């Protein structure tokens, strides 16, 4: 499969890595990325618990909501980290660990 990451609208910030790997993007998670992930996971677990009381399945409903929240929170954090590393988002921190390292 021929692949091409070239985006339609060019990055507006220094490109630290144009196609960062999965492990590299994950290792690039900042404290803000872990804050977004934890907030989305906690809100999802809360909604699962509160919506599950009436049917009587608050536990399993918490599990289902937490799974949805874990998926969405990881997705949001990965999005932010990869976009920073590709220069689509403000990434002064990534540029610091690039000039220095």
């Amino acid at each position: 499969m021929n692949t091409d990451i070239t985006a339609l609208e060019k990055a507006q910030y220094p490109v630290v890595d144009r196609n960062p790997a999965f492990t590299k993007v994950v290792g690039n998670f900042s404290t803000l990325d872990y804050l977004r992930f934890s907030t989305i996971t906690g809100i999802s677990v809360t909604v699962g618990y509160l919506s599950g009381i009436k049917p009587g399945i608050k536990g399993p409903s918490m599990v289902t909501g937490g799974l949805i929240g874990l998926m969405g929170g990881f997705m949001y954090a990965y999005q932010n980290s990869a976009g920073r590393l590709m220069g689509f988002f403000p990434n002064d921190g990534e540029v610091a660990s690039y000039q220095k390292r």
């Binding site: 404290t31 803000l32 804050l35 977004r36 934890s38 907030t39 996971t41 906690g42 809100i43 677990v45 809360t46 618990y49 509160l50 608050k58 536990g59 918490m62 937490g66």
Partner: peptide, 29 residues
Amino acid sequence: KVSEDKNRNYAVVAGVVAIVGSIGWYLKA
């Protein structure tokens, strides 16, 4: 002396994490 509903305790912790994470998210953005 102790709250025994473990699912409710987990949900309380989840709500606390949501609130604290929202505060930190605002403070660091």
